Design a protein around this nucleic acid. Sequence first.
RNA 1: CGGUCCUAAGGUAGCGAAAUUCCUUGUCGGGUAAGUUCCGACCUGCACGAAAAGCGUAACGACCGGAGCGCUGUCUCGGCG
RNA 2: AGCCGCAGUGAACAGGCUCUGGCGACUGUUUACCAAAAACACAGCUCUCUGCGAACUCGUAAGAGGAGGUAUAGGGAGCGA
RNA 3: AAAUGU
RNA 4: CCUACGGGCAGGCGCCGAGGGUAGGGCCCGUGACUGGGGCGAAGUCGUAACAAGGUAGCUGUACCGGAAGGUGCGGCUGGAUC
RNA 5: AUGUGGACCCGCCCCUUGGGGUGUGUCCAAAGGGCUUUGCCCGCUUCCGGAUGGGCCCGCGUCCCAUCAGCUAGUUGGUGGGGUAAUGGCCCACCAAGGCGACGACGGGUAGCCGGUCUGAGAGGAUGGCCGGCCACAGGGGCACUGAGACACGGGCCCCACUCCUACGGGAGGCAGCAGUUAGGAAUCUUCCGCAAUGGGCGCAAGCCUGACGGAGCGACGCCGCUUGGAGGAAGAAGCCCUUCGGGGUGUAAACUCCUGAACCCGGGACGAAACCCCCGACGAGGGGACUGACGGUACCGGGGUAAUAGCGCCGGCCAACUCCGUGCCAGCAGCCGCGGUAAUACGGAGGGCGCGAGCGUUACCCGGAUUCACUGGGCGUAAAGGGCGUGUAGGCGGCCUGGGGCGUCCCAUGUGAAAGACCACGGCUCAACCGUGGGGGAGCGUGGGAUACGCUCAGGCUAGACGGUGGGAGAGGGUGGUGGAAUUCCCGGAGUAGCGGUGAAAUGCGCAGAUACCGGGAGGAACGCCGAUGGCGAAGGCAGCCACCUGGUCCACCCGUGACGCUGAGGCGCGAAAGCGUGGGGAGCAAACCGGAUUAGAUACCCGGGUAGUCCACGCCCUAAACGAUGCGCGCUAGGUCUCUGGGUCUCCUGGGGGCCGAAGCUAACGCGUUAAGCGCGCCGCCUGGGGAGUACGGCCGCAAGGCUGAAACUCAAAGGAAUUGACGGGGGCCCGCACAAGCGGUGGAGC
Lengths: 125, 138
Amino acid sequence: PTINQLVRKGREKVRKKSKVPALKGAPFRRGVCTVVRTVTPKKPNSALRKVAKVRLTSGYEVTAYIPGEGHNLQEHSVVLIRGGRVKDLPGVRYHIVRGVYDAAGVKDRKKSRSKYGTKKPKEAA
Amino acid sequence: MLTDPIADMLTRIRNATRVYKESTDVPASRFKEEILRILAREGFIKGYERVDVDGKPYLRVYLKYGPRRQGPDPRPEQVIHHIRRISKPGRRVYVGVKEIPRVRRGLGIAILSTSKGVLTDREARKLGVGGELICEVW
RNA sequence: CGGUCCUAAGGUAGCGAAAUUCCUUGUCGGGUAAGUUCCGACCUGCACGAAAAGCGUAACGACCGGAGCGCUGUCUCGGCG
RNA sequence: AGCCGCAGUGAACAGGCUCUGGCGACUGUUUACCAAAAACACAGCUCUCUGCGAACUCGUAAGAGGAGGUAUAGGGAGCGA
RNA sequence: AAAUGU
RNA sequence: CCUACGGGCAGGCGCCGAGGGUAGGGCCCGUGACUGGGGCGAAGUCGUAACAAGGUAGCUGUACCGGAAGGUGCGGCUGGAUC
RNA sequence: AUGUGGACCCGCCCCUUGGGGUGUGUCCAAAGGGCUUUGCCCGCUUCCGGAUGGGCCCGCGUCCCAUCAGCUAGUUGGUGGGGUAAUGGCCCACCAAGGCGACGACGGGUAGCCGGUCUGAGAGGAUGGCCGGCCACAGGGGCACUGAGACACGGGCCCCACUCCUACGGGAGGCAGCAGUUAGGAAUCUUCCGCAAUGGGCGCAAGCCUGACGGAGCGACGCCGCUUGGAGGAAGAAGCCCUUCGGGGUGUAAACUCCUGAACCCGGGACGAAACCCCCGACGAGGGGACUGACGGUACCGGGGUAAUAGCGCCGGCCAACUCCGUGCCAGCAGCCGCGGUAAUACGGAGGGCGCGAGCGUUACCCGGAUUCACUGGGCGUAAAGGGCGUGUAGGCGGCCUGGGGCGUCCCAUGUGAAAGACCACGGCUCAACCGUGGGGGAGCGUGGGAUACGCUCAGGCUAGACGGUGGGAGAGGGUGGUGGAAUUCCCGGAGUAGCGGUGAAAUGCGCAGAUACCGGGAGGAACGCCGAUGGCGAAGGCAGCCACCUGGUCCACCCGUGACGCUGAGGCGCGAAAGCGUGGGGAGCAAACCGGAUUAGAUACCCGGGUAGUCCACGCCCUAAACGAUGCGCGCUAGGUCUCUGGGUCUCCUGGGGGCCGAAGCUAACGCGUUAAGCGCGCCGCCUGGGGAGUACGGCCGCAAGGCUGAAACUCAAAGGAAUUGACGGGGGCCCGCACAAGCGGUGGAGC
Ligand SMILES: [Mg+2]
Ligand SMILES: [Mg+2]
Ligand SMILES: [Mg+2]
Ligand SMILES: [Mg+2]
Ligand SMILES: [Mg+2]
Ligand SMILES: [Mg+2]
Ligand SMILES: [Mg+2]
Ligand SMILES: [Mg+2]
Ligand SMILES: [Mg+2]
Ligand SMILES: [Mg+2]
Ligand SMILES: [Mg+2]
Ligand SMILES: [Mg+2]
Ligand SMILES: [Mg+2]
Ligand SMILES: [Mg+2]
Ligand SMILES: [Mg+2]
Ligand SMILES: [Mg+2]
Ligand SMILES: [Mg+2]
Ligand SMILES: [Mg+2]
Ligand SMILES: [Mg+2]
Ligand SMILES: [Mg+2]
Ligand SMILES: [Mg+2]
Ligand SMILES: [Mg+2]
Ligand SMILES: [Mg+2]
Ligand SMILES: [Mg+2]
Ligand SMILES: [Mg+2]
Ligand SMILES: [Mg+2]
Ligand SMILES: [Mg+2]
Ligand SMILES: [Mg+2]
Ligand SMILES: [Mg+2]
Ligand SMILES: [Mg+2]
Ligand SMILES: [Mg+2]
Ligand SMILES: [Mg+2]
Ligand SMILES: [Mg+2]
Ligand SMILES: [Mg+2]
Ligand SMILES: [Mg+2]
Ligand SMILES: [Mg+2]
Ligand SMILES: [Mg+2]
Ligand SMILES: [Mg+2]
Ligand SMILES: [Mg+2]
Ligand SMILES: [Mg+2]
Ligand SMILES: [Mg+2]
Ligand SMILES: [Mg+2]
Ligand SMILES: [Mg+2]
Ligand SMILES: [Mg+2]
Ligand SMILES: [Mg+2]
Ligand SMILES: [Mg+2]
Ligand SMILES: [Mg+2]
Ligand SMILES: [Mg+2]
Ligand SMILES: [Mg+2]
Ligand SMILES: [Mg+2]
Ligand SMILES: [Mg+2]
Ligand SMILES: [Mg+2]
Ligand SMILES: [Mg+2]
Ligand SMILES: [Mg+2]
Ligand SMILES: [Mg+2]
Ligand SMILES: [Mg+2]
Ligand SMILES: [Mg+2]
Ligand SMILES: [Mg+2]
Ligand SMILES: [Mg+2]
Ligand SMILES: [Mg+2]
Ligand SMILES: [Mg+2]
Ligand SMILES: [Mg+2]
Ligand SMILES: [Mg+2]
Ligand SMILES: [Mg+2]
Ligand SMILES: [Mg+2]
Ligand SMILES: [Mg+2]
Ligand SMILES: [Mg+2]
Ligand SMILES: [Mg+2]
Ligand SMILES: [Mg+2]
Ligand SMILES: [Mg+2]
Ligand SMILES: [Mg+2]
Ligand SMILES: [Mg+2]
Ligand SMILES: [Mg+2]
Ligand SMILES: [Mg+2]
Ligand SMILES: [Mg+2]
Ligand SMILES: [Mg+2]
Ligand SMILES: [Mg+2]
Ligand SMILES: [Mg+2]
Ligand SMILES: [Mg+2]
Ligand SMILES: [Mg+2]
Ligand SMILES: [Mg+2]
Ligand SMILES: [Mg+2]
Ligand SMILES: [Mg+2]
Ligand SMILES: [Mg+2]
Ligand SMILES: [Mg+2]
Ligand SMILES: [Mg+2]
Ligand SMILES: [Mg+2]
Ligand SMILES: [Mg+2]
Ligand SMILES: [Mg+2]
Ligand SMILES: [Mg+2]
Ligand SMILES: [Mg+2]
Ligand SMILES: [Mg+2]
Ligand SMILES: [Mg+2]
Ligand SMILES: [Mg+2]
Ligand SMILES: [Mg+2]
Ligand SMILES: [Mg+2]
Ligand SMILES: [Mg+2]
Ligand SMILES: [Mg+2]
Ligand SMILES: [Mg+2]
Ligand SMILES: [Mg+2]
Ligand SMILES: [Mg+2]
Ligand SMILES: [Mg+2]
Ligand SMILES: [Mg+2]
Ligand SMILES: [Mg+2]
Ligand SMILES: [Mg+2]
Ligand SMILES: [Mg+2]
Ligand SMILES: [Mg+2]
Ligand SMILES: [Mg+2]
Ligand SMILES: [Mg+2]
Ligand SMILES: [Mg+2]
Ligand SMILES: [Mg+2]
Ligand SMILES: [Mg+2]
Ligand SMILES: [Mg+2]
Ligand SMILES: [Mg+2]
Ligand SMILES: [Mg+2]
Ligand SMILES: [Mg+2]
Ligand SMILES: [Mg+2]
Ligand SMILES: [Mg+2]
Ligand SMILES: [Mg+2]
Ligand SMILES: [Mg+2]
Ligand SMILES: [Mg+2]
Ligand SMILES: [Mg+2]
Ligand SMILES: [Mg+2]
Ligand SMILES: [Mg+2]
Ligand SMILES: [Mg+2]
Ligand SMILES: [Mg+2]
Ligand SMILES: [Mg+2]
Ligand SMILES: [Mg+2]
Ligand SMILES: [Mg+2]
Ligand SMILES: [Mg+2]
Ligand SMILES: [Mg+2]
Ligand SMILES: [Mg+2]
Ligand SMILES: [Mg+2]
Ligand SMILES: [Mg+2]
Ligand SMILES: [Mg+2]
Ligand SMILES: [Mg+2]
Ligand SMILES: [Mg+2]
Ligand SMILES: [Mg+2]
Ligand SMILES: [Mg+2]
Ligand SMILES: [Mg+2]
Ligand SMILES: [Mg+2]
Ligand SMILES: [Mg+2]
Ligand SMILES: [Mg+2]
Ligand SMILES: [Mg+2]
Ligand SMILES: [Mg+2]
Ligand SMILES: [Mg+2]
Ligand SMILES: [Mg+2]
Ligand SMILES: [Mg+2]
Ligand SMILES: [Mg+2]
Ligand SMILES: [Mg+2]
Ligand SMILES: [Mg+2]
Ligand SMILES: [Mg+2]
Ligand SMILES: [Mg+2]
Ligand SMILES: [Mg+2]
Ligand SMILES: [Mg+2]
Ligand SMILES: [Mg+2]
Ligand SMILES: [Mg+2]
Ligand SMILES: [Mg+2]
Ligand SMILES: [Mg+2]
Ligand SMILES: [Mg+2]
Ligand SMILES: [Mg+2]
Ligand SMILES: [Mg+2]
Ligand SMILES: [Mg+2]
Ligand SMILES: [Mg+2]
Ligand SMILES: [Mg+2]
Ligand SMILES: [Mg+2]
Ligand SMILES: [Mg+2]
Ligand SMILES: [Mg+2]
Ligand SMILES: [Mg+2]
Ligand SMILES: [Mg+2]
Ligand SMILES: [Mg+2]
Ligand SMILES: [Mg+2]
Ligand SMILES: [Mg+2]
Ligand SMILES: [Mg+2]
Ligand SMILES: [Mg+2]
Ligand SMILES: [Mg+2]
Ligand SMILES: [Mg+2]
Ligand SMILES: [Mg+2]
Ligand SMILES: [Mg+2]
Ligand SMILES: [Mg+2]
Ligand SMILES: [Mg+2]
Ligand SMILES: [Mg+2]
Ligand SMILES: [Mg+2]
Ligand SMILES: [Mg+2]
Ligand SMILES: [Mg+2]
Ligand SMILES: [Mg+2]
Ligand SMILES: [Mg+2]
Ligand SMILES: [Mg+2]
Ligand SMILES: [Mg+2]
Ligand SMILES: [Mg+2]
């Protein structure tokens, strides 16, 4: 533009929209499972991904993803929401942390146990 | 009309140079003058001569360049590789004596209007002044 | 979307359980502690629909309908003068 | 600035208010004597007739209304700002 | 005159 | 009542006064039968509008119409092929 | 009562906004307690100072939405009062009708502000938590009292909400103090010790109080420091992985041999503490003498002394680290690009490897990278972006000369810029983290003094910008009123038949009621052939037969007048093709919608026959567009060649103003632009910031309506895009071949095998 204009308006300051609004500047947020089911992802691939619909604190009810191999989640199961979409499944924008509240870790998982809420197994005897 | 005459001068030169000519005529002022001068004193130009054209005064400014190079495009290097208005009517640039350019590491030269007149970066520093930075040249 | 039969041509828009809806107190929503009425929706319009006009409309009405406030011998329930 | 009473438009003559539907735009008209209305009328829109001794109406006729007007006029019809 | 193809 | 009494205190009156009550507006959020499109999503149905002159050159503002893309009228644009 | 002394009215005095001095008049002071008592000490009352802490006021700075554009009755000023430590509309009267706002009032949303802090090359951006400074609140509100000081957290009155006690006879409480409980939450601790020290209150002083503070406690929450060992130790066991079965790997790793030795046991044991007080001297100066350590028997010191926890992430690309197996678009991974379909370095386990290590990951958020809001430091012909075109208000910007002013700007000096932090140097805890000492500097802001180049400003002066005069030029520039001819259509007459129309071919349609084709006449509407152009005019939309009137812009020549009067332009205002709207005309041709005939699977299309609004006129609305050169306006600068329209010239040629082409240099992502810029530059305006959602929704304004203007968000995609390249394709083209058709002879398809 010109300099005169710059005094008249200035430059606008972008702003940044969140992608985890269900959390409110929180690292996590506890919730309760409403539905627990399987869904079909973007054509790109194909499978039957496990996601829960979670009613949390703030009246909110969002679809959260259940990662790993199998779980222990019927309906009324307390949960803990993480943050991070799935990309395959549209609409889901949140993960569930394992081994916290009514959702437990992945059984007989030996590698990336930091996630998957899996405690270290005994190796000797 | 010409919102800026000083820019028009510089720009007239820059236009003239890029076609490698002898002289460059430009409307006269006592302030355009002591601005040129340096360009001879620092030997960016041959120099000028106050002349008149069609009853009206101008300043034929004589252009220096360099050696007829060889290879394709034998056109010589310029003396004036770069020159641009800084302070403008759209935005006037003033600086304290501290806040003062190191144009192309000494190789370049700023030009400024001060309480003692058309100094340079080097001069204005030593006289201890600073003022309205007109332009930079190299 | 298609087939087939028929017609002079087969109801467009917009409205629609309506001063029109038989089934009917249609179903849903609002109102109420409770609403066959009323208001708002759906459309399966028995049997709306464009000058015997269609759909709206501010203002107007001793017209007809539903709700509330206020106030009452209308009433609980009658008594006296 | 004060005075009195429960009360000062101290008696008498003087609207109860709101929200929201249907119908009719509206003031008006009507079944004298059971219906005042959502019926009639209404400005306004359309169709149609009518060249002037107009069409149309009354009358056997004369005559007259139309109109002492002449298509921006007049008659008939439906719808009804 | 001449449509289409996970 | 106290005298320090032309005084003072109690005490009575008044203006303001938290807030309460009645009434009418304004903004904002949540919510509502139903309804409007919109986005994404599986190898569903109908057609062929556009990209090759796309088999009617296309796009376009407006108008009317049609199950749907679209079609047609008026004017405009070339971001239109073609002896 | 005393009056140094102070206050108040009037005076003069100086000074100057109620400061100082004085004149008179009138009002004001009190306190005693203890003694190494006859002397001192702790207090009392008035005044002026000092110092410290403040109150009020002022200039400048301080967030988002204009989809909040108008706000205001103590409102603004005055006068006089009330009030305060004192100004003031702070309150109250009265008078006036002012006060504020595109430099963003008023309204709405969020927020305690700063020193700092985080990031950043910087400029910035982000942030205000511990520490420090200030403001504000003490359950929600109101109020005053006492007081030097408060409208007061642990003081008081009242109202409300809430909770508790009670023989219920009624009353009580305010953790945002220290701990602690509950609830909420992803989540944040001990109901510890001590006044030993520092600080604070009271007292002459002992001494007292101090959940300030000094310590301890809990939490890898962070930073820092340290351990789970060291030397040796094989051609290198076993086990586990691969294996081309030869071998390779883990791997000096282990074992094993020496050595030290965290922890733990014993002893000792602090600094932090020197004053208050006490002795002499006068309790002063002075020496001197004395008590006290919560942390704690702690750190540290000595000796003795034990080989003593390792985990987490990753190993497709970015990105460092590869192999078997299982799985088979399943189970699953994912920050993006993407991996999985029976041979997966991308899933799951394993071996091995890379990377950190009492840590490793993850999520959320801030800055960087992002030059992606671009001041430093960007763009708008086709990628997102030039306002449809004018006129113009505020505003921004401004040519040549000489003065005065010195506003901006520049220099010097000075004050201020707190401490803490950060940075530099050295010390202190065995280092570091922490901590101390000292130095290093502004930025800004006040004040003083200077400089005049520039901008500004006041004054004066010119003429190159701009405006004007005179003479003229071209032109479909605009408005009004007339007028002409060709043609279509219809009506009348004549003549004249058997078909005309129409198409790819037809049909619908018209025609023996005399059509088409031909002549003559009449009425009406609309548009103007050749000229005519790749041309001209207009700011744009746009403007075309001809005549007249009214009228705008513009170009040339002469170089006369005015004297910078300029350029741009948020808002405002005006114009603005077509369609469309209202009220009246008008209606030939054409033609949405509508009907019909054909085509077709269907054909609400294309082609054909009909056909109403509309198209045309007046007046008034609507205000859109591929309103395009997809290129805003004005000025200056930077090669030429050619074609043309229109001026002037000593009419070759030169020069002026337009309309195109190719092109120097230069620009561009390329295509291309190029004195008619997209080159080099200055001024000003409009606009852009991934695609979709969407020019939609809500709000506002405008409109009769249709709609126009302004114009988002959630959500969703990992691209959407520009130009160019090579291919393929085309119911695109040119050239050419093939039993590829055609030309010609035999068959297959039927029958039986
Ligand atoms: Mg796949
Ligand atoms: Mg697939
Ligand atoms: Mg993994
Ligand atoms: Mg028929
Ligand atoms: Mg019917
Ligand atoms: Mg119909
Ligand atoms: Mg219908
Ligand atoms: Mg409806
Ligand atoms: Mg009902
Ligand atoms: Mg009915
Ligand atoms: Mg019901
Ligand atoms: Mg109910
Ligand atoms: Mg109910
Ligand atoms: Mg009834
Ligand atoms: Mg109803
Ligand atoms: Mg009816
Ligand atoms: Mg009927
Ligand atoms: Mg009818
Ligand atoms: Mg009716
Ligand atoms: Mg109705
Ligand atoms: Mg009535
Ligand atoms: Mg009674
Ligand atoms: Mg009685
Ligand atoms: Mg009274
Ligand atoms: Mg009365
Ligand atoms: Mg009475
Ligand atoms: Mg009355
Ligand atoms: Mg109705
Ligand atoms: Mg009526
Ligand atoms: Mg009506
Ligand atoms: Mg009436
Ligand atoms: Mg009657
Ligand atoms: Mg009767
Ligand atoms: Mg009656
Ligand atoms: Mg009546
Ligand atoms: Mg008669
Ligand atoms: Mg008769
Ligand atoms: Mg007669
Ligand atoms: Mg008569
Ligand atoms: Mg008569
Ligand atoms: Mg009539
Ligand atoms: Mg009627
Ligand atoms: Mg199909
Ligand atoms: Mg009040
Ligand atoms: Mg009140
Ligand atoms: Mg309200
Ligand atoms: Mg919905
Ligand atoms: Mg589909
Ligand atoms: Mg098409
Ligand atoms: Mg097609
Ligand atoms: Mg076709
Ligand atoms: Mg086509
Ligand atoms: Mg095309
Ligand atoms: Mg169209
Ligand atoms: Mg329809
Ligand atoms: Mg249909
Ligand atoms: Mg389209
Ligand atoms: Mg067209
Ligand atoms: Mg155009
Ligand atoms: Mg006395
Ligand atoms: Mg005095
Ligand atoms: Mg006293
Ligand atoms: Mg005593
Ligand atoms: Mg103080
Ligand atoms: Mg007053
Ligand atoms: Mg006063
Ligand atoms: Mg006063
Ligand atoms: Mg006070
Ligand atoms: Mg603003
Ligand atoms: Mg607020
Ligand atoms: Mg706050
Ligand atoms: Mg800051
Ligand atoms: Mg830093
Ligand atoms: Mg740094
Ligand atoms: Mg900064
Ligand atoms: Mg800040
Ligand atoms: Mg914070
Ligand atoms: Mg804090
Ligand atoms: Mg602080
Ligand atoms: Mg509390
Ligand atoms: Mg207190
Ligand atoms: Mg208080
Ligand atoms: Mg306070
Ligand atoms: Mg307390
Ligand atoms: Mg507490
Ligand atoms: Mg909890
Ligand atoms: Mg606690
Ligand atoms: Mg603590
Ligand atoms: Mg102490
Ligand atoms: Mg002390
Ligand atoms: Mg003391
Ligand atoms: Mg004592
Ligand atoms: Mg105590
Ligand atoms: Mg204590
Ligand atoms: Mg402490
Ligand atoms: Mg620790
Ligand atoms: Mg942890
Ligand atoms: Mg080996
Ligand atoms: Mg081995
Ligand atoms: Mg070893
Ligand atoms: Mg040993
Ligand atoms: Mg000891
Ligand atoms: Mg002591
Ligand atoms: Mg001493
Ligand atoms: Mg001593
Ligand atoms: Mg010990
Ligand atoms: Mg030892
Ligand atoms: Mg060991
Ligand atoms: Mg060892
Ligand atoms: Mg890693
Ligand atoms: Mg890395
Ligand atoms: Mg690698
Ligand atoms: Mg193998
Ligand atoms: Mg397998
Ligand atoms: Mg495999
Ligand atoms: Mg494979
Ligand atoms: Mg990976
Ligand atoms: Mg793996
Ligand atoms: Mg391993
Ligand atoms: Mg490994
Ligand atoms: Mg910039
Ligand atoms: Mg850019
Ligand atoms: Mg530009
Ligand atoms: Mg485009
Ligand atoms: Mg574009
Ligand atoms: Mg333009
Ligand atoms: Mg404009
Ligand atoms: Mg416009
Ligand atoms: Mg101006
Ligand atoms: Mg100026
Ligand atoms: Mg100037
Ligand atoms: Mg300073
Ligand atoms: Mg001077
Ligand atoms: Mg001056
Ligand atoms: Mg002047
Ligand atoms: Mg003239
Ligand atoms: Mg002229
Ligand atoms: Mg002309
Ligand atoms: Mg003319
Ligand atoms: Mg004309
Ligand atoms: Mg004839
Ligand atoms: Mg004849
Ligand atoms: Mg026939
Ligand atoms: Mg015939
Ligand atoms: Mg015949
Ligand atoms: Mg003829
Ligand atoms: Mg032109
Ligand atoms: Mg044009
Ligand atoms: Mg003229
Ligand atoms: Mg002259
Ligand atoms: Mg003169
Ligand atoms: Mg202008
Ligand atoms: Mg504005
Ligand atoms: Mg107008
Ligand atoms: Mg228009
Ligand atoms: Mg038009
Ligand atoms: Mg219409
Ligand atoms: Mg019209
Ligand atoms: Mg009409
Ligand atoms: Mg036709
Ligand atoms: Mg058809
Ligand atoms: Mg047909
Ligand atoms: Mg069929
Ligand atoms: Mg047709
Ligand atoms: Mg545009
Ligand atoms: Mg241009
Ligand atoms: Mg402009
Ligand atoms: Mg000309
Ligand atoms: Mg000539
Ligand atoms: Mg030219
Ligand atoms: Mg070119
Ligand atoms: Mg070249
Ligand atoms: Mg040229
Ligand atoms: Mg976007
Ligand atoms: Mg977007
Ligand atoms: Mg968008
Ligand atoms: Mg819109
Ligand atoms: Mg639009
Ligand atoms: Mg909005
Ligand atoms: Mg709206
Ligand atoms: Mg626009
Ligand atoms: Mg392309
Ligand atoms: Mg080809
Ligand atoms: Mg081809
Ligand atoms: Mg060919
Ligand atoms: Mg053959
Ligand atoms: Mg044959
Ligand atoms: Mg044969
Ligand atoms: Mg066979
Ligand atoms: Mg056979």
